[PDB]
Write a sequence for this structure.
């Protein structure tokens, strides 16, 4: 298969554009050095907010935002090409529509300097996050060692429906870049394992440790944790075998859950019952997902973190 | 809240109707004794296949099948009334449509002796199981201590969308009665935790132990295992449940409120959040056109490996 | 040091005197067989209720109550002499005072067939147990391999003050014989460790497994679990105990010598330490005036919830 | 309930008063930032020695000692008032008696800027610590979300009687601020759990991390660990605490109500229970005559191994 | 790869040849039933003493001994050919040299009903076991899914040199059949992992549970435990083995390729590596002069503790 | 016994000899401070590469190499003599033969500043390491508290034969100093446990933490982990070692005395056992012809992947 490296990167305090640039060059130095230390490494993963940090007073301002693609994404692209590796990076992207808030964006770059995947955080961690819900869906790209790669961002990994989507579109190695799984420590480990098992795919996940807030995890396609980090600069590495995930989905019967979902009870009814019989699926597809207890909920907007509840662009 | 008890019941080898009757009387005696031992208990849970066992050569036959409701369910209901507890039972149910295979059914009986919940296994554990896919959806009923109870069956608990459905309909205590989802022992503990966390609800799960194949588990609404049984028959897994705390988490929490975020993405940047999830499989599954890219090359798409016909209809009689 | 064996005994259903004698013969059989398989073993421990079971309808009756010493204890003593081992046994003891309820009693017998220790359960597990609180304090006796043995019974192990008392009187090997204290499974493991650590002594604990309940446990004098049994009947928990090293720790340690510190607080600043601990409950409990600020608002202060009368005196005979 | 936050604070090297003021402002800074990061936090806890460090060569000198209250405590008071939180702070406090060594002191300040609890370490960690044994008992104050707060300091937590004392005076949230949980780390985890379980109360404990000796732990009233920090500086251990659940447990429970059982032995057979625990050490300690049998042969009974005089009085100027 | 099954078989008390025959039929019954339940299984493994039990008073007598091959082994072979699986069995083999004690033997029979591997326990568990040290070395045969099977017996697994020898002869799936890994439970788990890691091969190991012991264990070639059974009789430990990945690791690994490094020390500084390991015990053991410096003062060097004669030859007849 | 201290030393980025000089002074300061912190400590252990780092582009140059003995070793001897401790240090040693690559060396210095053990890395971690295979075998020296000390270096601890050799020469405390326990994390923990259990000796092992790449581990002679550090720089793993108890187990044990069994197989059946192990690899390795059957198809057999020449001699000067 292929060797993967997940880096428990310490993002510093970011005060200006000068600091963002230091992060970028620190990320590039670490990318080249990881490759130097592990010549066999083909996939190197950096966490969410590793480029621009988490300055909640500044992160919405023009100085703290970037374009994808831009001159900084091309610096990473140049770095991946020179090192001959796949690289995963995090960039808070300026929305081309100026009446809308910026995006939380992840990108994947191949060993030739080509951006082969772009994803915008579909589920921002609210009420703390002011990012606009993504519009690129859950994309999948071709990676090393026969892997089909997809990336989600921190809070995204808590939604099992999203993990299903990546797998539904071919993904067998599910990448989760993460900024803060703080106080949500147990559940970060839990969901990484469940996202793997539910869909018969690998999960490679890493949280920012900057400087002591993160962890790093690689799970087998059966949900077994293979590698686990504890510290800033911890490099979580592991050997991935995408073909084994592909083989399980093709040759498994008893625990082929991803297949059973759309082909319920196929032994009694040839082909299986296609209608899952779930009202929430039908409501969400139509776009009227409503929980019975919504009217009595206390936090339905980001007012508690000093954000306006009017909408549009703010913090520019 | 309330006190729950889950029984790692030993079902024996079932060779006839006499064994089934013995199993019913065994389950009844266990119910009264569990109430006698734990006076505060309000919910007693027996695992899948506890009534009828797993005689794979006879379990599709008419002698091994029961009606819901019938004289067997009335004995369980009589017991629930006399012991003053909520009961959860398993019954392989004779399909009213004679052209179709029987159902794998779970029922909940209240302290009055009434079936307040009936559920047919939506996802049979194929290729080994010949049961017909359930047609009653995922129902939710009122339980003790302000709980909303929903029951799934063994293999059902491996599907996270089903745990979402129960919660979507109000469930704060998700019950998983389980037959023999063995060798998937790691993933049984895993999914019970994830089913709880994803939906901010309790999970109370139990498997058959008999003759040494069981496990028993109660999980908190944050996904933390509160109580855990080993692999011994007759092991009673009990614990105190606080359904209001699960409800309060759903109402008060912001950062970890994942069940809300699914249908209301980014409610800080966009007012009320984006209602469209942007997921192709959701739209495909709703229309019934759910298809995986690798379906053509799959090896197991029927139950011929275990001797069952591939043609469909009623068989095994 | 010496080798110990803690037996996760299965006491069957006890319905008559005939079943008690069968238990007695089973225990004697096991003790002889344990020595046969483990030639170097010097201490063999049986759990609470192993002699008489837990028939809560009959356990206060004359048929179910024995004398200490009596013809039954002499049989245990005979076996201990024949096998040349130390034996720890459980007996529900008839109260010499017929106006008081029977005691929950444990004994230790030496390889000479003599009762060297007799303990009556100081803290009966209420409100479920009708046993009279013991009057013999917390005794300590000489044992094998340089040990000073003391025994507590199930619920007694939840009381840290009791573990301190045994240790205060010289005990370096703390035995906990446990009946049915189930559901409190995590806290059984926790307290065995903490009882050991607080006092710098070994703990050797065993619970009844019969049909599947108990988990034998051997802890080092620093609170570390050395041997842990599962939940199966007939599991024999064995380990090599070195009592001299517990003594050595008590003599040589400075930083973690907590048992000394309690009576000599801050001895560096004040030579010999402050002897007054500064705790009100200690002085209250000593004068028998220990009272919690919330005692008037408590709901369970009698055994009526299990059916026992609140009047006092002898009942259930 | 209420949200708590315990900082695995790094104390740097402290060589002068200059460094002490540096730490004070660092703590104030951390207090404000934690409230900003966690909007609903009501209780913020800092470890032992966070203000003054552990410069054992200098920590007894007048430059390294403060008064309670003083201008340093006032800076903390102001910070808590501005942040609207309860703060827990460490101060090595100059002794009012000039012939006695300084006290190792913990203080709790409320959101109104008032010190509502002042505790002096009752059991200094001998022979390494030269602090005078505290003279203000084990105090309890009113806290947020209906909590009754009490604080003990590192080594104190190894004494179960001190945990008993706090609970006896109403405490339902037991705070442990610590400056040594290295190589005693396993036992630090163990005792935080046992202190909680024994007394049916929460424990919130945090050890100094700087810079790598740290720890952070929240335990539920049944002794289960809810949150666990690793060994890094600046790790903030946070969780939601429900003191009313601990209160409910103390009132509702029968079987596991060990704190009540201590004073009312076997209340079923003897109504109201036996008030005399029947423990010699309780009576000895109350009278100031607590004496271990092996005390005369103990190696360490003074602080000479760390270079402290054995004569007492005021030293280390 | 292939699917393996390890049966935690319960051996009963064995008192005669009639009981041995019962055990043979039970094993055959289990083999057909396991193949029926797991249609894909290609290797079924039974533990040490499953045929004959551990009647120490009788296990050396002619009645309790069998021939390999004999009519009993051909009954096992008949089962393997009918069920179409590889089977691993335990037989206490009568020594063809009647002046020597019987062997403790393990055999592997292929799906064509033929013995393809025969092994005699090289390291009997002394002083409890009276079996003659095996003379057949450590053989390796071809198994299912491209595996190279080798078998060792319980105590054998505690010797790392033996695990090396099997791998040195091609083994990538190391089978360990076990009678008692009791009170050696922790070290059984430990060495099953280490035998795997040291040699870059799978280990599949199962112990008797008969009545409660066996801990079925499948380890990955990097030493990680993949499947783990508890202590119950009849537990079937199953998992998929991929023997070719163990082969690939041996051919492709540089850094952690320890099996190669042993005979090729520092090949970067010295091409081909230094072939002499520089170990005196390796040279001593090859020459049969392995001697520990403390052997003169050792207590147990014969079997007198378990009643065995110390002068050798045939005994127990 | 004695108190050991294993420092999870942070290796800095070493660019010059000045940086090497900083490391030496850092280590000396650490050594003095650890003795001051723990007055009872007798053994202070520093990891591999602590003196010189891992500058793979410069670590073969003469500037980055030292002599044993040398002025740098005498500075450690100075420190050890002043502190009155046993010290363990790592030095990349200039090869006295100019045509050979330098050695990876470890030394033990007694309380009188004398080198009492010199060991050269027998198994350099290939392909990454260019160090020459050690020519001093596995030496054993007298240590504190009755200990026989032996030292191995990182990758050495992966070879069970080497751990056997040390014990074969009297070692009861096996020290492992390591550079990277990274991506080898689990296997480092496993082998430290197995090295202990296989040979009935203690293992004290520590890895470089600096910037976050290590752990520290003390295992009992039965393979049980007693103390475990995390991944932080400057963590000091300490514990009490009792070498006499490892000796006692070797003298007193029968059943689990595996180190004796290796040279005396089946000694009950055949007095004194069969001295011939019956293992081909032992005889091949003693003869210098260790040859695995797959060696011809192996990929990595040199250090070209890390840029090292494939013809030998002295390179990187």
């Amino acid at each position: 298969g292929f060797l993967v490296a997940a880096i428990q990167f310490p993002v510093p305090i970011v005060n200006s554009r000068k600091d963002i640039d230091h992060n970028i060059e620190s990320i590039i130095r670490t990318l080249h050095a990881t490759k130097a230390g592990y010549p066999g490494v083909e996939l190197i993963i950096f966490p969410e907010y590793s480029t621009q940090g988490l300055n909640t007073a500044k992160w919405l301002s023009e100085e703290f935002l970037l374009d994808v693609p831009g001159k900084e994404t091309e610096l990473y692209a140049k770095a991946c090409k020179e090192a001959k590796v796949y690289g995963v990076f995090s960039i808070m992207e300026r929305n081309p529509d100026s009446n809308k808030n910026p995006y939380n964006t992840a990108i994947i770059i191949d060993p030739q300097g080509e951006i082969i995947l772009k994803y915008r955080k579909l589920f921002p961690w609210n009420p703390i996050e002011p990012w606009y819900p993504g519009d690129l869906g859950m994309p999948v790209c071709e990676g090393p060692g026969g892997s089909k790669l997809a990336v989600c961002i921190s809070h995204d990994g808590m939604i099992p429906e999203l993990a299903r989507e990546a797998a539904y579109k071919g993904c067998n190695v599910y990448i989760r870049i993460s900024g803060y799984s703080t106080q949500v420590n147990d559940q970060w480990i839990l969901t990484n394992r469940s996202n793997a098992w539910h869909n018969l795919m690998y999960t490679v996940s890493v949280n920012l440790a900057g400087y002591y807030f993160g962890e790093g995890q690689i799970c087998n396609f059966d949900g077994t944790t293979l590698v686990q980090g504890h510290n800033p600069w911890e490099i979580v590495t592991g050997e991935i075998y995408p073909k084994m995930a592909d083989n399980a989905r093709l040759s498994w019967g008893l625990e082929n859950n991803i297949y059973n979902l759309g082909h319920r009870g196929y032994v009694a009814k040839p082909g299986g019952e296609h209608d899952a019989g779930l009202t929430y699926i039908k409501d969400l597809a139509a776009g009227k997902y409503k929980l019975p207890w919504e009217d009595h909920m206390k936090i339905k907007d980001g007012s508690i973190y000093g954000y306006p509840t009017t909408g549009g662009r703010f913090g520019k």
